[PDB]
Every structure is written in C-alpha cells, then in structure tokens.
Design a protein around this ligand. Sequence first.
Ligand SMILES: Nc1ncnc2c1ncn2[C@@H]1O[C@H](COP(=O)(O)CP(=O)(O)O)[C@@H](O)[C@H]1O
Ligand SMILES: [Mg+2]
Ligand SMILES: [Mg+2]
Length: 233
Amino acid sequence: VPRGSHMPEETQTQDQPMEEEEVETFAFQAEIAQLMSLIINTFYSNKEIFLRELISNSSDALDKIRYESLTDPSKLDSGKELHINLIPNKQDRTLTIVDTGIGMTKADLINNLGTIARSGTKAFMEALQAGADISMIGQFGVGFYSAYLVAEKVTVITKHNDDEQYAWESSAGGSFTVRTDTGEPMGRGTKVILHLKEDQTEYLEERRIKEIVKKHSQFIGYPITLFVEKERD
Ligand SMILES: Nc1ncnc2c1ncn2[C@@H]1O[C@H](COP(=O)(O)CP(=O)(O)O)[C@@H](O)[C@H]1O
Ligand SMILES: [Mg+2]
Ligand SMILES: [Mg+2]
C-alpha cells in the first residue's frame, strides 16, 4: 500500500505509558488548622507581607546550599545560579515564587508544611485577637501560612537532592495532599504557586510587586528577578 505523504494524525506517535502518581491526604495539626481559618477569614491590613515571608523561606533554603557544601562539596559542582524568580501569570491568576534552594523531601513537606505543631501558633492567634499586625507572623514561626492572606489555594512543587519531585497542595479547610509529581522536572529547589483570590489581583502587577519587594525584602542576599509577560497588541 504505497504512500507519498501522511497526515499529522497518522504519524502521531503512540503515547508514552501512563504514569501513576501516589497521593496521600493529611490533616493539618489542630492549631495550624485554626490559624489557617483565622488568616483566611479575617480582614487584615498589610496582607502584602505574604511575599516577604515566602522570599525569606527561599533565602533560608538558598543559604542552606552554601552550608551543605561544607559536608557535601559536590553541590559546588552544580551550575545552577542561586536565585529567586517571581512569576505573575495574569492569564491564570497565579503568582509563583521560584528558588534554587535545597528543596524539600516528601517527609519534609508532610512534617514542615502542616503535621508538626509550631510552638508559637497559639500565642500568635492570641496576639492577633489582641489586635497585632499580621506582619508579626514571621516572629511566631508560622510565616508560610501568610500565603492564605492572598491565595485561595497554594501548590508547592519541590525537588531535594535526596528524594524525587513532589507536589503539596491545600485549599485550607483542614487538610492537604502530597503527591509524587511526574510532570515538568523543575530541578533542585521549590516553586510556591499562589492561586490568588479574586480581590487580590494587584499582586500580579509589576509595579505592586516591585513596591513590596523594595519595602519588605531588601536583604535577600541573592538575585531576585521579576518575569513580566509582554502585553499583547
Ligand atoms: N522555599 C522553601 N524551600 C525549602 N523549604 C521551605 C520553603 N518554604 C518553606 N519551607 C519549609 O517550610 C518550613 C516552614 O516555614 P515557615 O516560614 O512557616 C517557619 P520558618 O522555619 O521559616 O521560621 C521551613 O522551615 C522550611 O523547612
Ligand atoms: Mg519562614
Ligand atoms: Mg539572609
């Protein structure tokens, strides 16, 4: 059956075997769940400090690269730049904070992002009740959850040298999931994807992002870059 030309659908290659991703669901530690509901459902002045908290966590993870090289010098051989990228996507209403820090293992995600108690949680909720500024959250050891000031859902994609790539996700409500992530390999580090609330889209705007970086995050110690999607004609 001679052919001289085939159509695209004919020479489309058969799919790669379907990947299985294992998913685990966990309850937040009880006081972390209470804090998340307080953060989500209360009006605060000064919500913009969420970005300072996430940049601080990236900066901590980057500092760990430098020090882990003292017990494991092979990290010196990585050609990856130590940096942070901020990536607003107006199409999808997401703000992503990307770093090339150490990343998290699966058990790091489960323990550090929601199942282990933090000793400051109860004191912080009392300080908030008593009218403290939400900015105080970092000093109480619970800064990550500031993401929920502006995001309705948070997805964390991460890769640590000692484990495979994982995705953590929570829309609050008391639980989170951790699953293996067989999609786009992101390389060592962490991506925090903020699915912004509808009234918090200012944090997609170039000027607003630059304003709050300059106000709150001037001593990162690593390059930070803002990716701005070109406005279409
Ligand atoms: N970008 C990132 N890279 C690596 N680990 C991160 C991270 N963001 C958060 N984490 C992990 O999440 C933990 C909780 O962060 P918090 O900001 O809530 C409290 P703290 O440990 O920074 O004082 C961090 O200790 C770290 O283990
Ligand atoms: Mg922190
Ligand atoms: Mg520092």
